[PDB]
Design a protein around this motif. Structure first.
Motif, mmCIF file in Angstrom:
data_model
loop_
_atom_site.group_PDB
_atom_site.id
_atom_site.type_symbol
_atom_site.label_atom_id
_atom_site.label_comp_id
_atom_site.label_asym_id
_atom_site.label_seq_id
_atom_site.Cartn_x
_atom_site.Cartn_y
_atom_site.Cartn_z
ATOM 1 N N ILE A 207 31.919 73.932 37.920
ATOM 2 C CA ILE A 207 32.981 75.062 37.466
ATOM 3 C C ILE A 207 32.297 76.210 38.086
ATOM 4 O O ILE A 207 32.809 77.389 38.070
ATOM 5 C CB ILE A 207 33.115 75.158 36.106
ATOM 6 C CG1 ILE A 207 31.944 75.232 35.157
ATOM 7 C CG2 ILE A 207 34.098 74.071 35.730
ATOM 8 C CD1 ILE A 207 31.877 75.370 33.630
ATOM 9 N N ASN A 208 30.814 76.278 38.461
ATOM 10 C CA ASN A 208 30.135 77.544 38.997
ATOM 11 C C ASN A 208 29.547 77.275 40.367
ATOM 12 O O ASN A 208 29.007 76.138 40.641
ATOM 13 C CB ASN A 208 29.066 77.740 37.669
ATOM 14 C CG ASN A 208 29.461 77.920 36.517
ATOM 15 O OD1 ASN A 208 30.388 78.757 36.114
ATOM 16 N ND2 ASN A 208 28.593 77.060 35.613
ATOM 17 N N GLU B 50 25.702 74.080 37.673
ATOM 18 C CA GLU B 50 26.839 74.082 38.477
ATOM 19 C C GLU B 50 27.975 73.585 37.500
ATOM 20 O O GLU B 50 29.155 73.921 37.657
ATOM 21 C CB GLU B 50 26.974 73.381 39.646
ATOM 22 C CG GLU B 50 26.070 73.644 40.813
ATOM 23 C CD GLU B 50 26.303 72.878 42.014
ATOM 24 O OE1 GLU B 50 26.900 72.947 43.082
ATOM 25 O OE2 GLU B 50 25.356 71.574 41.958
ATOM 26 N N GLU B 51 27.606 72.626 36.571
ATOM 27 C CA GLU B 51 28.851 72.039 35.514
ATOM 28 C C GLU B 51 28.867 72.841 34.392
ATOM 29 O O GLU B 51 29.701 72.527 33.606
ATOM 30 C CB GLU B 51 28.464 70.474 35.356
ATOM 31 C CG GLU B 51 27.396 70.190 34.475
ATOM 32 C CD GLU B 51 27.341 68.693 33.777
ATOM 33 O OE1 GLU B 51 28.414 68.341 33.763
ATOM 34 O OE2 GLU B 51 26.098 68.539 33.381
ATOM 35 N N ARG C 264 27.770 73.454 26.551
ATOM 36 C CA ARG C 264 28.457 73.088 27.917
ATOM 37 C C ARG C 264 29.378 74.080 28.147
ATOM 38 O O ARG C 264 29.846 75.000 27.306
ATOM 39 C CB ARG C 264 28.929 71.593 27.626
ATOM 40 C CG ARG C 264 27.994 70.524 27.577
ATOM 41 C CD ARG C 264 28.477 69.300 27.134
ATOM 42 N NE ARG C 264 28.695 69.149 25.550
ATOM 43 C CZ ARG C 264 28.078 68.781 24.823
ATOM 44 N NH1 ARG C 264 26.749 68.079 25.075
ATOM 45 N NH2 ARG C 264 27.929 68.886 23.376
ATOM 46 N N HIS C 265 30.122 73.918 29.377
ATOM 47 C CA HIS C 265 31.425 74.517 29.600
ATOM 48 C C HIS C 265 31.190 76.042 30.068
ATOM 49 O O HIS C 265 32.051 76.756 29.817
ATOM 50 C CB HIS C 265 32.693 74.321 28.960
ATOM 51 C CG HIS C 265 32.559 72.936 28.629
ATOM 52 N ND1 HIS C 265 32.810 72.324 27.415
ATOM 53 C CD2 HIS C 265 32.921 71.648 29.527
ATOM 54 C CE1 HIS C 265 32.864 70.962 27.339
ATOM 55 N NE2 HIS C 265 32.919 70.639 28.624
ATOM 56 N N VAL C 266 29.788 76.437 30.293
ATOM 57 C CA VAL C 266 29.416 77.982 30.301
ATOM 58 C C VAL C 266 29.662 78.546 31.557
ATOM 59 O O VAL C 266 29.075 77.841 32.727
ATOM 60 C CB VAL C 266 27.857 77.988 29.737
ATOM 61 C CG1 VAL C 266 27.580 79.555 29.793
ATOM 62 C CG2 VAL C 266 27.960 77.729 28.192
ATOM 63 N N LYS C 267 30.043 79.592 32.001
ATOM 64 C CA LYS C 267 30.153 80.362 33.186
ATOM 65 C C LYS C 267 29.336 81.420 33.516
ATOM 66 O O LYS C 267 28.992 81.892 34.617
ATOM 67 C CB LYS C 267 31.797 80.772 33.470
ATOM 68 C CG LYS C 267 32.307 81.649 32.669
ATOM 69 C CD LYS C 267 33.581 82.186 33.360
ATOM 70 C CE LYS C 267 34.037 83.369 32.602
ATOM 71 N NZ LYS C 267 35.039 82.653 31.494
ATOM 72 N N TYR C 268 28.603 81.848 32.319
ATOM 73 C CA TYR C 268 27.663 83.203 32.439
ATOM 74 C C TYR C 268 26.859 83.091 31.303
ATOM 75 O O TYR C 268 27.254 82.920 30.085
ATOM 76 C CB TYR C 268 28.460 84.317 32.296
ATOM 77 C CG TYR C 268 27.837 85.693 32.308
ATOM 78 C CD1 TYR C 268 27.058 86.320 33.368
ATOM 79 C CD2 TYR C 268 27.562 86.262 30.892
ATOM 80 C CE1 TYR C 268 26.420 87.480 33.308
ATOM 81 C CE2 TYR C 268 26.833 87.549 30.852
ATOM 82 C CZ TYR C 268 26.316 88.066 32.070
ATOM 83 O OH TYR C 268 25.450 89.071 31.863
#
Length: 438
Positions: free
Chosen positions: A6-7, A193-194, A229-233
């Motif tokens: 996701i990143n 990345e995940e 989990r599922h973190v973008k920043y």
């Protein structure tokens, strides 16, 4: 690649890397060599942004920097890492045996970073109080220095390295590339990345997202996930932390005795947030970036609005007395000590970036003018010969920077650093005329 990604490292480059090489300015207190303005006594206390002559724009060509508690790292166009500040526990990553070598910015030997010879480059630097980190374009992490704790040196890596004096490859701790760093005081966070978050360092304030019993503090001193989990920043204050998820939910954990985590109206001594907890923010607000100090936090929206929470004793949150909200925490003596929910700042320009040191902050308006506030005694706000704390975000106006477009800012324990470019005479006059008319 896999479908879990996701990143990308590219997603963060606008925050960290300037396209243009920068004039670097330093100010505040440099009793431990933090200012990087050389050895002279007069240059260990500097009350306004001072052009750093050891980092000339046309030669050093600095395009990024990361300010820690007592040291700073900078990156140039050819991806060399420069450092200055306190080398007592190896944080500079170079031989320095004020001390002239420590107070003078200089390059870490290129050979100290094997990825460079392979054509890889640094995409982000990070500096805590006592440790340093470089993230490479191939996902590799080099680290040096150490982590302290309340009572002394904790160590660097497990029970194997106490103090790391030169850059050192951190053994792979994910199946995905690392994409972002977030340094605290004596811990560092990593994002992959995940969207998995890893933490490494001291854990006495629950900053690692897990309780660590005494006898396991060295056995487990390496980057580890903690179910987030599922973190973008990611972003970090000294002993508290932030994560923004793919679904735009902001969580915090760690030290919370001044409500710096922004999760609860209830302010209590010794409070720690153990499991990451959601901050309540209006539905309107998309998070751009976060900066946090010891006891305060600053949340910047994409539209340029700034929300602060935490300590008020040294005006850290930058809210004036006559506008303090009803949920302001007052102690048993009736003194307002904290603003524990994120609170929008009013009567300020729109900001494009923000940085926070221990008890001060610096924000950059959309037009490239820097604004500072908070603890004034160390002159880290760069507002001249006044020791008193600065209550609200206040324009930094001085000869050295008045006609500069400020691009990057960073703050440490007792000092601040900026990077900017001269505006053309045309643009400088236009902005000056605009600011004078208000």
């Amino acid at each position: 690649h896999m479908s879990h990604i996701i990143n990308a490292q590219e997603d963060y480059k606008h925050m960290y890397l300037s396209v243009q090489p920068l004039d670097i300015f330093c100010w505040g207190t440099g009793s431990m060599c933090e200012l990087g303005l050389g050895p002279l006594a007069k240059n260990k206390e500097v009350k306004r942004p001072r052009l750093n002559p050891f980092l000339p724009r046309d030669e050093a060509k600095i395009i990024s920097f990361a300010v820690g508690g007592m040291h700073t790292l900078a990156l140039d166009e050819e991806s060399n890492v420069w450092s200055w500040g306190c080398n007592d526990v190896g944080a500079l990553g170079r031989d320095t045996s004020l001390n002239e070598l420590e107070s003078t910015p200089a390059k870490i030997p290129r050979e100290s970073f094997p990825p460079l010879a392979e054509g890889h480059k640094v995409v982000q630097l990070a500096a805590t109080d006592n440790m340093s980190c470089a993230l490479f374009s191939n996902g590799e992490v080099y680290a040096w220095g150490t982590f302290r704790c309340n009572e002394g040196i904790l160590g660097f890596y497990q029970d194997k390295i106490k103090i790391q004096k030169t850059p050192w490859k951190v053994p792979t701790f994910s199946k995905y590339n690392i994409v972002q760093l977030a340094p605290g005081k004596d811990h560092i966070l990593f994002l992959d990345e995940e969207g998995m978050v890893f933490a490494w360092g001291n854990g006495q304030q629950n900053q690692l997202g897990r309780k660590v019993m005494e006898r396991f503090r060295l056995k487990t001193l390496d980057p580890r996930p903690f179910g987030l989990r599922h973190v973008k920043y990611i972003a970090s204050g000294e002993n508290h932390c932030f994560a923004l998820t793919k679904d735009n939910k902001l969580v915090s954990w760690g030290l919370n005795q001044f409500g710096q985590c922004g999760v609860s109206e209830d302010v209590e001594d010794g409070a720690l947030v153990t499991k990451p907890k959601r901050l309540a923010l209006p539905d309107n607000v998309v998070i751009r970036s976060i900066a946090a100090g010891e006891h305060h936090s600053l949340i910047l929206s994409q539209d340029g609005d700034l929300y602060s929470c935490g300590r008020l004793d040294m005006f850290e949150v930058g809210i004036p007395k006559d506008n303090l909200p009803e949920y302001t925490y007052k102690d048993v003596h009736g003194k307002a000590r904290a603003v524990p929910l994120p609170t929008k700042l009013n009567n300020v320009p729109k900001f494009k970036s923000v940085a926070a040191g221990s008890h001060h902050s610096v924000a950059v308006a959309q037009n490239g003018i820097a604004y500072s506030w908070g603890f004034g005694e160390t002159y880290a706000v760069g507002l001249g010969p006044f020791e008193d704390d600065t209550e609200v975000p206040t324009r930094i106006k001085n000869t050295a920077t008045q006609d500069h477009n400020i691009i990057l800012v960073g703050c440490g324990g007792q000092f601040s650093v900026s990077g900017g470019v001269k505006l053309s005479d045309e643009d400088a006059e236009k902005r000056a005329d605009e600011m004078d008319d208000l």
